[PDB]
Short mmCIF file of C-alpha atoms and ligand atoms in Angstrom, two decimals:
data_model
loop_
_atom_site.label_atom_id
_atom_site.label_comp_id
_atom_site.label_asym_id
_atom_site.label_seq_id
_atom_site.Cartn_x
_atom_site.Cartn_y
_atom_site.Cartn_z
CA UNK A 337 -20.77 -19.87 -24.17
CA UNK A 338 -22.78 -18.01 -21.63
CA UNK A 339 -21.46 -20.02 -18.65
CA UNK A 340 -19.77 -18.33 -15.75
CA UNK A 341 -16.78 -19.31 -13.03
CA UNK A 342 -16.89 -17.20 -10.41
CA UNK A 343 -14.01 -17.04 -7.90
CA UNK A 344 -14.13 -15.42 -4.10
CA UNK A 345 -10.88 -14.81 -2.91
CA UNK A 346 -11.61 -15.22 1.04
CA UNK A 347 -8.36 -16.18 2.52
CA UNK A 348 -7.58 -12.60 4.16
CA UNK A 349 -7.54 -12.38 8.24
CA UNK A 350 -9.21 -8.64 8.03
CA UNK A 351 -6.71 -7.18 10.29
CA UNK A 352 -7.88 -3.88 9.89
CA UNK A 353 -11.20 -5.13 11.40
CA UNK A 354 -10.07 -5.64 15.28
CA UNK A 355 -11.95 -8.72 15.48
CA UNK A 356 -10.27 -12.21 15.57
CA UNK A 357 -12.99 -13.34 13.42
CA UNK A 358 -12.21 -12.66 10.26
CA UNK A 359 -14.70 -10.22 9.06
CA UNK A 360 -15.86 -12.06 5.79
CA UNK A 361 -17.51 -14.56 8.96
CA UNK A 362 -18.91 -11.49 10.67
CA UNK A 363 -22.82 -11.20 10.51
CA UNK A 364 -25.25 -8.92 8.98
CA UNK A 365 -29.11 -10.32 9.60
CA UNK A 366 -27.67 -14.07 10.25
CA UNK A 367 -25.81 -14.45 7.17
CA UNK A 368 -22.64 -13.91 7.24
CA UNK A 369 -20.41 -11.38 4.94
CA UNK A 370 -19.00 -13.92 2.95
CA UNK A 371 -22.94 -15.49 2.54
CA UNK A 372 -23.91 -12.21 1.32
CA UNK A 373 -21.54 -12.36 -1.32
CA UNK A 374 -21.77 -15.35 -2.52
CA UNK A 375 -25.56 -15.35 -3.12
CA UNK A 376 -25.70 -12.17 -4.58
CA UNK A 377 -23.42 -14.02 -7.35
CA UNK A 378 -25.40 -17.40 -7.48
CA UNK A 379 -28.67 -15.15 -7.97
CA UNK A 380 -27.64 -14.58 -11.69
CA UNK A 381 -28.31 -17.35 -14.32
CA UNK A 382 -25.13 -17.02 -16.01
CA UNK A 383 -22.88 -18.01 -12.95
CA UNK A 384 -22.48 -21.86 -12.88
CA UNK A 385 -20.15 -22.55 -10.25
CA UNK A 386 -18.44 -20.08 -7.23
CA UNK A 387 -14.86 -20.98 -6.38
CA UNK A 388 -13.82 -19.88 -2.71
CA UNK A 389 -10.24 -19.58 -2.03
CA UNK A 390 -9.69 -20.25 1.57
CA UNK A 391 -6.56 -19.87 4.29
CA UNK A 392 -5.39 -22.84 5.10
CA UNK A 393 -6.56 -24.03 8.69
CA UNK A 394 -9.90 -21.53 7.96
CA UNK A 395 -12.44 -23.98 10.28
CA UNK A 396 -14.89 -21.87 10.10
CA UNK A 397 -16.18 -22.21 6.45
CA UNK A 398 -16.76 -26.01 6.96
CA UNK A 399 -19.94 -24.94 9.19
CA UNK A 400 -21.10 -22.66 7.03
CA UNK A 401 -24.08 -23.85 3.73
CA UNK A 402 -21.67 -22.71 1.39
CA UNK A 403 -19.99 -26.01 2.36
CA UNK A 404 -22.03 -28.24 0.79
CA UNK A 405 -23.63 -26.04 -1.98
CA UNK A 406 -23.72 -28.40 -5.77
CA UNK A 407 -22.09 -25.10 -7.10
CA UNK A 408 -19.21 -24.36 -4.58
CA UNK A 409 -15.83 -25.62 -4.86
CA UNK A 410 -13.29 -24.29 -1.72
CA UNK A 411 -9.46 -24.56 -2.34
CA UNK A 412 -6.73 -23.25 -0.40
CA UNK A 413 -6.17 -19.14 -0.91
CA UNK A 414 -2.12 -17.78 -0.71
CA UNK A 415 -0.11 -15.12 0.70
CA UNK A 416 -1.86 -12.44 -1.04
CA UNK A 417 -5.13 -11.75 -2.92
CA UNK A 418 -3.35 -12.33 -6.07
CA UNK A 419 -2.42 -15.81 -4.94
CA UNK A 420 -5.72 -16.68 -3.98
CA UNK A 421 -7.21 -15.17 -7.37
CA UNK A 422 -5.20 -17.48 -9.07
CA UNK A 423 -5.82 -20.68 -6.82
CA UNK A 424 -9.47 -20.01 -7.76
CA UNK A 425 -8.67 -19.85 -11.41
CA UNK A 426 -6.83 -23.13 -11.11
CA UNK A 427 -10.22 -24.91 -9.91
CA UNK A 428 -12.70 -22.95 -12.30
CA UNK A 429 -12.82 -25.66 -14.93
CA UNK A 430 -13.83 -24.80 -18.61
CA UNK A 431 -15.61 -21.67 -18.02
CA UNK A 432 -14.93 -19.23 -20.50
CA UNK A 433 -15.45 -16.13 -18.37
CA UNK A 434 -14.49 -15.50 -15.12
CA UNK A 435 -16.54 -13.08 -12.53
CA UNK A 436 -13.81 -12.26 -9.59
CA UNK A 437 -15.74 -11.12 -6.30
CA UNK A 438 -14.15 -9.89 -3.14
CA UNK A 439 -15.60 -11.93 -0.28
CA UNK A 440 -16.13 -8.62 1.67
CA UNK A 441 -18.85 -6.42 -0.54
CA UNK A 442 -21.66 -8.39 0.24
CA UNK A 443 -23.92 -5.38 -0.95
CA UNK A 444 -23.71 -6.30 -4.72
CA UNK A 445 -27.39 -5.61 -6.58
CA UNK A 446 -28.42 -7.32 -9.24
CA UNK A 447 -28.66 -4.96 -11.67
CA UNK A 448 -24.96 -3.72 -11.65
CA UNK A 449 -23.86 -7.38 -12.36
CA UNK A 450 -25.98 -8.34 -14.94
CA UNK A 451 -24.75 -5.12 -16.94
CA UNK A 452 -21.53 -6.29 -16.06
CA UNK A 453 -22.15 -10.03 -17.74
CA UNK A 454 -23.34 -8.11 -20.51
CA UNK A 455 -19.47 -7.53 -21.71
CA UNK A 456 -18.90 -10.94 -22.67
CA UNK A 457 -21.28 -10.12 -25.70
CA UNK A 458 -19.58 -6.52 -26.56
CA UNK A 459 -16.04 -7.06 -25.25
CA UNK A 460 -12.69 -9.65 -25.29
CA UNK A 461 -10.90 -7.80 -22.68
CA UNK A 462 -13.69 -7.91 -20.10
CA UNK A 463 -14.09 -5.03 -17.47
CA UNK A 464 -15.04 -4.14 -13.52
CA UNK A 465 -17.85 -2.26 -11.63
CA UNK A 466 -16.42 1.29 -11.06
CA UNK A 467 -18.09 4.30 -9.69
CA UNK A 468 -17.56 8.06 -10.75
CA UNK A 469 -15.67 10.22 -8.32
CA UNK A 470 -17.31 12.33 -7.18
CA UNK A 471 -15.35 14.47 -4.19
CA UNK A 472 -12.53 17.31 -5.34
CA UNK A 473 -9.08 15.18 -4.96
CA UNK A 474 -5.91 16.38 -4.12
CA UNK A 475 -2.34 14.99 -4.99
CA UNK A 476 -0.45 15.28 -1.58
CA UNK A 477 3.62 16.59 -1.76
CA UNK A 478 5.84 13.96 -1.37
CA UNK A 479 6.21 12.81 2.19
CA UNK A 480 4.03 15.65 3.43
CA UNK A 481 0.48 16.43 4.28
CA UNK A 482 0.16 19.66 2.19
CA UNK A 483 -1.26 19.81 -1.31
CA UNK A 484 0.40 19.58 -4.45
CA UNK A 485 -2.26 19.79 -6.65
CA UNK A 486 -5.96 19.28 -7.48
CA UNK A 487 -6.27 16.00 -9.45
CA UNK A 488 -8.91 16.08 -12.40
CA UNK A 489 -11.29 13.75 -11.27
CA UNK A 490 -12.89 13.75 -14.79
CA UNK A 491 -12.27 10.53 -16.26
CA UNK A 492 -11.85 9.00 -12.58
CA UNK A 493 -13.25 6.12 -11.21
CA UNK A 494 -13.40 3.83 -7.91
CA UNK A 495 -12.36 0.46 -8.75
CA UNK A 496 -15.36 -2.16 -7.20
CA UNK A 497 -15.85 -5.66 -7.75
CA UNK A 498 -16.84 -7.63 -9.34
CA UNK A 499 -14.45 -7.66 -12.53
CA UNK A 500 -15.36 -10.02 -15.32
CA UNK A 501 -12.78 -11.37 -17.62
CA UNK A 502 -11.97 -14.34 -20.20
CA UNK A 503 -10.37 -17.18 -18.08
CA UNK A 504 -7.80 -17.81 -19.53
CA UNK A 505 -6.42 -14.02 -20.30
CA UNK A 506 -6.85 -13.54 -16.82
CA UNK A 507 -4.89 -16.30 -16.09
CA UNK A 508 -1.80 -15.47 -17.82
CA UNK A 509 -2.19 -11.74 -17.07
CA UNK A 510 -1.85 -12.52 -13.66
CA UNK A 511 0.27 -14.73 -13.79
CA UNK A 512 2.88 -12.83 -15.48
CA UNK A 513 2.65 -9.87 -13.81
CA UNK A 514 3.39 -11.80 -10.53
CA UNK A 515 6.35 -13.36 -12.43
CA UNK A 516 7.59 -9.94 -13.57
CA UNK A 517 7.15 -8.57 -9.59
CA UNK A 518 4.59 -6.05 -11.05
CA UNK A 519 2.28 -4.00 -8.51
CA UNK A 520 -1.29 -5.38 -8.28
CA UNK A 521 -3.98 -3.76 -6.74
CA UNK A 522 -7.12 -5.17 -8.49
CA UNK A 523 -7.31 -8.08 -11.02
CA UNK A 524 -8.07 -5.24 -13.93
CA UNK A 525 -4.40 -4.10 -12.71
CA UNK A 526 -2.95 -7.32 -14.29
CA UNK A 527 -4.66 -7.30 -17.29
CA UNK A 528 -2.99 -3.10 -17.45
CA UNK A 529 0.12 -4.52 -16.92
CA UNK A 530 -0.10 -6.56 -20.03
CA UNK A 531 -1.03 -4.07 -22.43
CA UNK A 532 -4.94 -4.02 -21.85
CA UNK A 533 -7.58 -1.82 -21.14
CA UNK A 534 -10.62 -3.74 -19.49
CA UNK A 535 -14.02 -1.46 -19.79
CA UNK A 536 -15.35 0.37 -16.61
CA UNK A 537 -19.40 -0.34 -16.03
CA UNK A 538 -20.66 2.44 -14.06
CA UNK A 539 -21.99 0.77 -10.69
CA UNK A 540 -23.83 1.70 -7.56
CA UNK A 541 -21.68 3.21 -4.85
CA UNK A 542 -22.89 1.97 -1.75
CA UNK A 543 -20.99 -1.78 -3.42
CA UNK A 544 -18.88 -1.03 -0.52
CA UNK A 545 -15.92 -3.32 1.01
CA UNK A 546 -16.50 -3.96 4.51
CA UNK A 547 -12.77 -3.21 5.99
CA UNK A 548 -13.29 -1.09 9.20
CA UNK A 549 -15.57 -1.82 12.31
CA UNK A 550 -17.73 0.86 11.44
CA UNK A 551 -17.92 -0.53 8.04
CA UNK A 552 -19.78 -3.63 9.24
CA UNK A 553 -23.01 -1.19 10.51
CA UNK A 554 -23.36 0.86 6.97
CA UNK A 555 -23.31 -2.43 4.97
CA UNK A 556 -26.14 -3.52 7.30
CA UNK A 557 -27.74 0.04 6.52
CA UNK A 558 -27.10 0.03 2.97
CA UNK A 559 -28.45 -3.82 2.75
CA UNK A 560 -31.90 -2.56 4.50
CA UNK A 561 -33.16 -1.29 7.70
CA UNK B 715 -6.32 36.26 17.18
CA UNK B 716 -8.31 33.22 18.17
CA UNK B 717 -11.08 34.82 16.71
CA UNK B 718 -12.84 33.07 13.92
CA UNK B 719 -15.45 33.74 11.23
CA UNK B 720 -17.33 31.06 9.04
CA UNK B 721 -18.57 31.41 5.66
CA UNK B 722 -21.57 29.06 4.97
CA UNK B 723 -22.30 28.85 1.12
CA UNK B 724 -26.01 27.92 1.01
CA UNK B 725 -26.73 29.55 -2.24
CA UNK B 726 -27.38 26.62 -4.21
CA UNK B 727 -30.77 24.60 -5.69
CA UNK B 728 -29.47 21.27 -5.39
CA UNK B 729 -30.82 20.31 -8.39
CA UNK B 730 -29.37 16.89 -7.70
CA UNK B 731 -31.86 16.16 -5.48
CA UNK B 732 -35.18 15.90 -7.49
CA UNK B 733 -37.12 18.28 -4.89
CA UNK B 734 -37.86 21.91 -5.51
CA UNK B 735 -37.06 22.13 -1.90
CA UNK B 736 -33.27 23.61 -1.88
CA UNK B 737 -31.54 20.25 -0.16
CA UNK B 738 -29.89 22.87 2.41
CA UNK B 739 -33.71 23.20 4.00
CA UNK B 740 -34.58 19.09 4.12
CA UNK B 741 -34.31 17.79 6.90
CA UNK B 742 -32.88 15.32 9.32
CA UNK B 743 -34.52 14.74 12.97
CA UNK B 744 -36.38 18.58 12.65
CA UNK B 745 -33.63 20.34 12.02
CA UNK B 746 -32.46 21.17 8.86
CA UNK B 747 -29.46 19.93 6.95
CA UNK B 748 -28.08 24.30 6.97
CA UNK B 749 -29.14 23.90 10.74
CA UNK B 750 -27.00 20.76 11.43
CA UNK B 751 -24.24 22.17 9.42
CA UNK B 752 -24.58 25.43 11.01
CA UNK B 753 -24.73 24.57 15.01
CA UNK B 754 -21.42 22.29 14.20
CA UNK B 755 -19.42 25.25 13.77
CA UNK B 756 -20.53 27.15 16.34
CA UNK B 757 -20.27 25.02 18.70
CA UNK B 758 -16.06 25.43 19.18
CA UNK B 759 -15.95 28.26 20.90
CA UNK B 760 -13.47 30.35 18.44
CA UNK B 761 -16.20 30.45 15.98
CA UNK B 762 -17.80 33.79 17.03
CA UNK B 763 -19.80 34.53 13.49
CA UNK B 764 -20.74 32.81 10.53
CA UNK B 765 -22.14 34.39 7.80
CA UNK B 766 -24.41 32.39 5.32
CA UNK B 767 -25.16 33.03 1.67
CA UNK B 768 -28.48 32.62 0.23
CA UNK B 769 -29.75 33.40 -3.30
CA UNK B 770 -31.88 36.49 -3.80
CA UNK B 771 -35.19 35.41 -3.51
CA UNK B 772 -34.57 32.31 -0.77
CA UNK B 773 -37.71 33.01 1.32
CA UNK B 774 -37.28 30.18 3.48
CA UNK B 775 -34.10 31.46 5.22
CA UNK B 776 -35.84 33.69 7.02
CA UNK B 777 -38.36 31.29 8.85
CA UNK B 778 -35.36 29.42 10.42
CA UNK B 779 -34.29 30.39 14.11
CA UNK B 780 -30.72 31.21 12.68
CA UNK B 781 -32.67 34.54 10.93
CA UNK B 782 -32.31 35.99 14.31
CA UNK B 783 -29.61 34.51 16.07
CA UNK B 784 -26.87 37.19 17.35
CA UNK B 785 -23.62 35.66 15.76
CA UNK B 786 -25.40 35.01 12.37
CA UNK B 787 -25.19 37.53 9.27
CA UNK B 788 -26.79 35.88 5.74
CA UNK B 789 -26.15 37.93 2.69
CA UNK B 790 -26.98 37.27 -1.01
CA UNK B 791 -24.69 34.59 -2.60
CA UNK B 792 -24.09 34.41 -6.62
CA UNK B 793 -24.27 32.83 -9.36
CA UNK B 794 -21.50 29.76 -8.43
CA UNK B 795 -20.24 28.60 -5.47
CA UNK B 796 -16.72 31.25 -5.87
CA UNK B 797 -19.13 33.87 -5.78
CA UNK B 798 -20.98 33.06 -3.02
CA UNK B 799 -18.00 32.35 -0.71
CA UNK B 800 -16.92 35.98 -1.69
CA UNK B 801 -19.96 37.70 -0.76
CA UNK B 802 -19.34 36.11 2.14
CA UNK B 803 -16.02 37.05 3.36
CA UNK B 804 -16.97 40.71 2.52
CA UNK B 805 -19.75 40.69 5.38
CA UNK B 806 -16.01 38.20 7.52
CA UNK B 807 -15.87 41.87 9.53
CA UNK B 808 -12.30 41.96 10.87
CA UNK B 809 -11.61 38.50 11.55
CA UNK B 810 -8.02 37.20 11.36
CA UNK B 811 -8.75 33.64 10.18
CA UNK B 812 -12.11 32.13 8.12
CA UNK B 813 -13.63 28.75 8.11
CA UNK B 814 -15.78 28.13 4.80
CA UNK B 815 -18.31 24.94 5.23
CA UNK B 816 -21.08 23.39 3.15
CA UNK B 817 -24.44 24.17 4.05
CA UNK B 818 -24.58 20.25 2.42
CA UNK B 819 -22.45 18.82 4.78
CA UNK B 820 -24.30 18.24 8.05
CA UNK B 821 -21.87 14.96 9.49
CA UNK B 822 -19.58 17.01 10.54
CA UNK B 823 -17.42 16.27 14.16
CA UNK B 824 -16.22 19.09 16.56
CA UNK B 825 -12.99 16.60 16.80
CA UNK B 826 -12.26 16.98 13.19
CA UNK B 827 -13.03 20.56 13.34
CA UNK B 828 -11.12 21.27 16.30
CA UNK B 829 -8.04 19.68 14.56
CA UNK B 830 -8.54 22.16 11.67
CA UNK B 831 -8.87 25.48 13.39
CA UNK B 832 -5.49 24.21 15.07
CA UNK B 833 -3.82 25.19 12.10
CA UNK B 834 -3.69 29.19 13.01
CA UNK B 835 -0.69 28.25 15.65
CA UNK B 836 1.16 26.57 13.07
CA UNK B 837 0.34 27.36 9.56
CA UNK B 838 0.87 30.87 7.18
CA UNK B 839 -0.95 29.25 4.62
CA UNK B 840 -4.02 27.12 6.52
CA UNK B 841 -5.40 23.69 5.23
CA UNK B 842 -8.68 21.49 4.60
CA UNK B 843 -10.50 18.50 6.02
CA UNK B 844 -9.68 15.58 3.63
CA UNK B 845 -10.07 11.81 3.93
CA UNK B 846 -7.41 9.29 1.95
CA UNK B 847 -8.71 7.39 -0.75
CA UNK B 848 -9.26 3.79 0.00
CA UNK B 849 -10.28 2.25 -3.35
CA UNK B 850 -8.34 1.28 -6.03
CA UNK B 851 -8.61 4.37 -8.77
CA UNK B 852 -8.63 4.03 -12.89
CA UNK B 853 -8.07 6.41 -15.06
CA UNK B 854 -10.20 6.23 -18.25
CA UNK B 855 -8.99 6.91 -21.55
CA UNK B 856 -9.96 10.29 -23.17
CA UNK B 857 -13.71 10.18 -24.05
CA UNK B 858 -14.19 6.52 -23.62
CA UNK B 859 -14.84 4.13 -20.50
CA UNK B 860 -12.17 2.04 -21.09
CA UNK B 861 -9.38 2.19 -17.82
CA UNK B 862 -6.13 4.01 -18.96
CA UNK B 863 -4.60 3.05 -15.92
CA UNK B 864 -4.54 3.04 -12.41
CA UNK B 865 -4.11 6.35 -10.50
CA UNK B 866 -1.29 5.84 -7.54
CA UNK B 867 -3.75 6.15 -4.12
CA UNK B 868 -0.66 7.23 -2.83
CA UNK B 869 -0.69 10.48 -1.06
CA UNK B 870 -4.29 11.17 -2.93
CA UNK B 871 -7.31 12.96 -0.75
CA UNK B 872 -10.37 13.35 -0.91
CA UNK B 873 -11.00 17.01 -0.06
CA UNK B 874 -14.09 18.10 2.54
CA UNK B 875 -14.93 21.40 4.09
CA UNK B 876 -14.21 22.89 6.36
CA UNK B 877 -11.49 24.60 4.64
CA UNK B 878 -9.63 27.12 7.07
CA UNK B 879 -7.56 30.06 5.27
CA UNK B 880 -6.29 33.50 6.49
CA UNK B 881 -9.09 35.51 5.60
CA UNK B 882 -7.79 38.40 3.61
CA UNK B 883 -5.53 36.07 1.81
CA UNK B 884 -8.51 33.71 0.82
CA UNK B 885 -10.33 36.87 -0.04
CA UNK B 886 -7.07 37.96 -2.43
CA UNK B 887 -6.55 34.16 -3.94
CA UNK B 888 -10.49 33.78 -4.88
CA UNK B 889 -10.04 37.02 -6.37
CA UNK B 890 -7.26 36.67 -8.61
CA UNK B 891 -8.15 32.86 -9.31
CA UNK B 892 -11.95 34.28 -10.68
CA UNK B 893 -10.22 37.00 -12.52
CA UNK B 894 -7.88 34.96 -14.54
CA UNK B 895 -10.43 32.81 -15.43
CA UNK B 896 -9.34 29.69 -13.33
CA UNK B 897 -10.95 26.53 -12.45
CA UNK B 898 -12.14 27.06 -9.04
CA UNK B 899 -13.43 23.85 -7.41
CA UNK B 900 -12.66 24.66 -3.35
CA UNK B 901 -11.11 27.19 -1.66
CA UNK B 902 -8.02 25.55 -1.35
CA UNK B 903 -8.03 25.34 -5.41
CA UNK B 904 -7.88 29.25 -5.02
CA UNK B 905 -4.64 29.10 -2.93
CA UNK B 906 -3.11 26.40 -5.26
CA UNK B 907 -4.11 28.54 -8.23
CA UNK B 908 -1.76 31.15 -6.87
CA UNK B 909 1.50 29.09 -5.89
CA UNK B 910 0.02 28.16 -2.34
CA UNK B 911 0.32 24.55 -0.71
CA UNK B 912 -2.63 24.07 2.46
CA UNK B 913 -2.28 21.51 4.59
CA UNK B 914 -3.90 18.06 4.87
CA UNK B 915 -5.78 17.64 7.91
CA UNK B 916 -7.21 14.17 8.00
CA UNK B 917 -10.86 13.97 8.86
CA UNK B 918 -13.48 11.11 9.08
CA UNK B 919 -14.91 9.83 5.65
CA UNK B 920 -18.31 10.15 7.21
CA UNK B 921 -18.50 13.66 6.63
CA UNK B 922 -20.21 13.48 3.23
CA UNK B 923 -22.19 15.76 0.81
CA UNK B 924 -25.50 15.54 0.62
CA UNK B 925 -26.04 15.81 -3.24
CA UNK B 926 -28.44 13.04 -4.57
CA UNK B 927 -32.01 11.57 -3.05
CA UNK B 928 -30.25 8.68 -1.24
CA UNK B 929 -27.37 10.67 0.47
CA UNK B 930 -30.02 12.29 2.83
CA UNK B 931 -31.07 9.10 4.32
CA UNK B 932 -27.65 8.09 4.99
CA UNK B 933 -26.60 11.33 6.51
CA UNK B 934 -29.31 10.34 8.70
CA UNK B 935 -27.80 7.34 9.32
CA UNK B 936 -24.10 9.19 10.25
CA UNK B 937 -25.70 11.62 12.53
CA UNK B 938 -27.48 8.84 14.45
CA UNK B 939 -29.88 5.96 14.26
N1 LIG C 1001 -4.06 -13.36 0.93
C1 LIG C 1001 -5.30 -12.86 0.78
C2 LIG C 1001 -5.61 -11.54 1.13
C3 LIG C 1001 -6.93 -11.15 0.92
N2 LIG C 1001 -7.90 -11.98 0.40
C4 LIG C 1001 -9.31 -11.51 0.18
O1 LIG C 1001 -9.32 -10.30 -0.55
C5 LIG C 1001 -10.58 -9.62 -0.33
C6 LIG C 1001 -10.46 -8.20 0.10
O2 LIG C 1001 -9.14 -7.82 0.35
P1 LIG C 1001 -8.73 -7.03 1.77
O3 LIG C 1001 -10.05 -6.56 2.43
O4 LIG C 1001 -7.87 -5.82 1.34
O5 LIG C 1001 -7.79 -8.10 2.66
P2 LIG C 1001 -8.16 -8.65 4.18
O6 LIG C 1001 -6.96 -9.57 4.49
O7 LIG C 1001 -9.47 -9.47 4.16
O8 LIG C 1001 -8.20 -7.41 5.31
P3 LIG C 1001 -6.82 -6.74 5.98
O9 LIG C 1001 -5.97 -6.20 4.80
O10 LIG C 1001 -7.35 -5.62 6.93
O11 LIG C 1001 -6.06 -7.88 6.75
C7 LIG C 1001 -11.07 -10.20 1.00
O12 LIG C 1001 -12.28 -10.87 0.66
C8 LIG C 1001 -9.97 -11.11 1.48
O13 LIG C 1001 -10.39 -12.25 2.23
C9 LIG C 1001 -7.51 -13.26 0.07
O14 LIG C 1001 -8.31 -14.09 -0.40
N3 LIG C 1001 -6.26 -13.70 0.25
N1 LIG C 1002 -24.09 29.48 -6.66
C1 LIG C 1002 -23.94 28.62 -5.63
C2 LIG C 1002 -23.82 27.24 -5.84
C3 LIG C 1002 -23.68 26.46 -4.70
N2 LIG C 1002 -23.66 26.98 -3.41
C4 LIG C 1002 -23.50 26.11 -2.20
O1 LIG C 1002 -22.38 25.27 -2.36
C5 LIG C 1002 -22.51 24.12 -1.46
C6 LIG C 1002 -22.36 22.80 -2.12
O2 LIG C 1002 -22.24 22.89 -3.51
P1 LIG C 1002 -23.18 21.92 -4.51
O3 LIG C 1002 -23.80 20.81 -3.63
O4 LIG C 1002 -22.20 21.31 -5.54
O5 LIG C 1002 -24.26 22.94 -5.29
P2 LIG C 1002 -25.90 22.84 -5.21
O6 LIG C 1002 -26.36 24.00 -6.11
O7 LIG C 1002 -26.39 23.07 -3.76
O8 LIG C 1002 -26.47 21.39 -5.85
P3 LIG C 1002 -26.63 21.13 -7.50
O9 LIG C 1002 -25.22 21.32 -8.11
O10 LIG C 1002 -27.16 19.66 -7.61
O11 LIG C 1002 -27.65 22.19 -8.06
C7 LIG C 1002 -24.02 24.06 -1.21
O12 LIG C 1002 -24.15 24.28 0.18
C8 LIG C 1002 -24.63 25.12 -2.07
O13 LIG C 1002 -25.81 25.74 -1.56
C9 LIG C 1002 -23.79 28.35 -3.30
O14 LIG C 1002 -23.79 28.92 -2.18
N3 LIG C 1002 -23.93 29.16 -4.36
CA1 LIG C 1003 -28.49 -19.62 -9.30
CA1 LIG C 1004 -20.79 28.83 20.36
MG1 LIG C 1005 -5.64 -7.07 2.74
MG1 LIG C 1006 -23.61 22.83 -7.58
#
């Protein structure tokens, strides 16, 4: 009962990073991004097998470890993340649970997921790492940059990774909210689509997702230094 | 009419941050955080005064080299943030325009602020530094951690300081706003609280609040490592 799938979606190009490298292969220490990420998932006992969904043509991943790790399995990502989510889910055998990790916060700790395994003994909707906000929002006007309104950011909350769900709900959550052309953001997002209401596990906020260059430098910081 | 005058609220105990030393007086380098905040807005040259608010008592204040510096005023601030900004724009002197800053926000970028104090040629109403969310936002359901929904990222801000108002009209709208017994959060809530709409000015994310022990060792890491 207590074993895990875990599925990387890693078939993005990080445009927004400038580098032609995508930035899940871009270094912090000598490890790369991806690396990061991946370990920080194989580190707890629970997960049993990681599931990276690559592009197609990605020759880069074939040099990495990762390649010939007993507990990775690498299949071909899509168009989008949700694609890619869902070609991991395809190769994630019998698990029961599902942990779904973007390839690009390589500064998970330890302690964060383990609290977030934890739901598979309290919970049958599952949940996601989310952190309090914690800066006044405002609600722009429509079209323009002048305020609306102050948004209550009581009972807000920054959507991380990783989100842990039953397989198979996650599965057919995503997979009809793709049929039905529904907006996803994260894979919680499908499972809101379909009527649930996944729990939020307060997590550290430095879990950031590398996206812009000057990204890559505070994930080294918040790593170590 | 160029003429500016800054309002520094530096009032607070951070209590946030586990010392008894107020968090305004750590500091980065040798300089304190009030310091760094402090010399960033004087150094654009329409800043010609900037008057910080300290709570009765604050006997460090006055061993700083801003205690004697010739475009510097500090009175005594109150008992929340509101009435500290007020005491401050009473002391404002004549200026058309005021710039209100966080003593807690020592990242900030003369290019960021000199796109704010543009706002006197072409606003009524003036505006704030704010950064657009990036993550994915939930809304939890009443009382509970369980997600709601998601929040549209749309056209949502995080809102920063500087915040740059006509000065006798932020002096009116923090008035009224206190008075009625609104929820103040920034100044610009005081404007909205009274029908008003300030502009958006985008500014960089690093710009953060130091509030808890591990934000002043990576406002270290923004100004420089
Ligand atoms: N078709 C896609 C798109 C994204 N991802 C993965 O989704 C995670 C994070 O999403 P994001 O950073 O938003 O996408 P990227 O394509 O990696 O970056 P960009 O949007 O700047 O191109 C990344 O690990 C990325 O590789 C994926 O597997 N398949
Ligand atoms: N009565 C108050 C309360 C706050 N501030 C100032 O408001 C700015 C930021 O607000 P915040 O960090 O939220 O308040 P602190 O009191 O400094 O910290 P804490 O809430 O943890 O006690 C700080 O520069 C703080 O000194 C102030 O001048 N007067
Ligand atoms: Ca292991
Ligand atoms: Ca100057
Ligand atoms: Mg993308
Ligand atoms: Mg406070």
């Amino acid at each position: 009962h207590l074993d895990v799938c875990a599925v990387v979606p890693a078939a993005g190009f990080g445009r927004r990073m400038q580098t032609e490298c995508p930035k899940q292969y871009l270094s912090i220490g000598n490890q790369t991004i991806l690396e990061h990420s991946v370990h920080a998932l194989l580190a707890h006992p629970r997960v049993k097998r990681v599931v990276i969904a690559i592009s197609p043509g990605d020759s880069r991943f074939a040099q990495l470890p990762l390649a010939n790790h007993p507990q990775i399995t690498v299949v071909d990502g899509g168009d989008e993340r949700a694609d890619s989510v869902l070609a991991g889910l395809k190769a994630a055998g019998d698990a029961q649970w599902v942990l779904v990790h973007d390839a690009a916060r390589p500064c998970l700790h330890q302690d964060d997921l383990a609290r977030l395994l934890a739901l598979s003994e309290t919970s049958r909707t599952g949940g996601i790492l989310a952190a309090p906000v914690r800066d006044t929002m405002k609600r722009a006007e429509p079209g323009k940059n002048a305020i609306a309104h102050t948004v209550d950011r009581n009972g807000l909350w920054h959507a991380l990774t990783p989100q842990f769900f039953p397989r198979e709900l996650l599965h057919d959550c995503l997979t009809r909210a793709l049929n039905e052309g529904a907006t996803i953001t994260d894979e919680a997002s499908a499972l809101e689509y379909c009527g649930f209401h996944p729990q939020l596990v307060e997590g550290r906020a430095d879990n950031i997702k590398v996206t812009r260059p000057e990204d890559l430098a505070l994930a080294e910081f918040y790593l170590t230094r």
